[PDB]
Design an enzyme around this catalytic site. Structure first.
Site, PDB file in Angstrom:
ATOM      1  N   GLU A  84      -3.177   5.313   6.115  1.00  0.00           N
ATOM      2  CA  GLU A  84      -3.155   6.753   6.361  1.00  0.00           C
ATOM      3  C   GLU A  84      -4.029   7.135   7.558  1.00  0.00           C
ATOM      4  OE1 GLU A  84      -1.226   8.895   5.261  1.00  0.00           O
ATOM      5  OE2 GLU A  84      -0.392   8.019   3.421  1.00  0.00           O
ATOM      6  N   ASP A 130       6.503  20.706  10.293  1.00  0.00           N
ATOM      7  CA  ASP A 130       6.589  21.949   9.529  1.00  0.00           C
ATOM      8  C   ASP A 130       5.362  22.842   9.681  1.00  0.00           C
ATOM      9  OD1 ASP A 130       4.626  20.842   7.885  1.00  0.00           O
ATOM     10  OD2 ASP A 130       5.850  20.787   6.075  1.00  0.00           O
ATOM     11  N   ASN A 170      -2.556  16.989   2.635  1.00  0.00           N
ATOM     12  CA  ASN A 170      -1.756  17.951   3.387  1.00  0.00           C
ATOM     13  C   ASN A 170      -2.036  19.391   2.968  1.00  0.00           C
ATOM     14  OD1 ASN A 170       1.117  19.537   3.433  1.00  0.00           O
ATOM     15  ND2 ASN A 170       0.989  18.133   5.166  1.00  0.00           N
TER      16      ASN A 170
HETATM   17 RE   LIG Z   1       5.352  26.100   4.591  1.00  0.00          RE
END
Ligand SMILES: [Re]
Ligand SMILES: [Br-]
Ligand SMILES: [Cl-]
Ligand SMILES: [Cl-]
Ligand SMILES: [Cl-]
Ligand SMILES: [Cl-]
Ligand SMILES: [Cl-]
Ligand code: NA
Ligand SMILES: [Re]
Ligand SMILES: [Re]
Ligand SMILES: [Re]
Ligand SMILES: [Re]
Ligand SMILES: [Re]
EC number: 3.2.1.17
Length: 129
Positions: free
Chosen positions: A35, A48, A59
């Site tokens: 990661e 996004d 996230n």
């Molecule tokens: Re979103």
């Protein structure tokens, strides 16, 4: 902070990740490797508009607040910046919530694609623990 492999293993063990939700310590070290390359300050902006933060790339769409991810949640009740600290407490506590939410460590795509099914014990081999 960029952790060494064994140093991170020991810290993750002190923070209760060894066998947490049944995932041995090497799974967590492997996930952190792929990661973040063990860098607590790693960030990655997603297409996004959410961002992934810290050693486990947690996230902002669901887990932490960064103030710039519209419509998102903050299910770990932390500022995303807390996930960048040299102290791993916030990242570990949030990761414990994530791994408990139904899909285990598949929540980390890099774990599924690069650690799952492999000899993850190799990540802690030789370390004083
Ligand atoms: Re979103
Ligand atoms: Br200590
Ligand atoms: Cl390494
Ligand atoms: Cl292991
Ligand atoms: Cl936000
Ligand atoms: Cl911005
Ligand atoms: Cl906040
Ligand atoms: Na958020
Ligand atoms: Re320690
Ligand atoms: Re262990
Ligand atoms: Re699991
Ligand atoms: Re194994
Ligand atoms: Re320990």
């Amino acid at each position: 902070k960029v952790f060494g492999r064994c140093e991170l293993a020991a810290a993750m063990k002190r923070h209760g990740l060894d066998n947490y939700r049944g995932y041995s310590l090497g799974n967590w070290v492997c996930a952190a490797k792929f990661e973040s390359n063990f860098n607590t300050q790693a960030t990655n902006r997603n297409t996004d508009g959410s961002t992934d933060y810290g050693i486990l790339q947690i996230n902002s769409r669901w887990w932490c607040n960064d103030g710039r991810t519209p419509g998102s949640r903050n299910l770990c009740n932390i500022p995303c910046s807390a996930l960048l600290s040299s102290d791993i407490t916030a990242s570990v506590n949030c990761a414990k919530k994530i791994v408990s939410d139904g899909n285990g460590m598949n929540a980390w795509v890099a774990w599924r694609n690069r650690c799952k099914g492999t000899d993850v014990q190799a990540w802690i081999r030789g370390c004083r623990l």
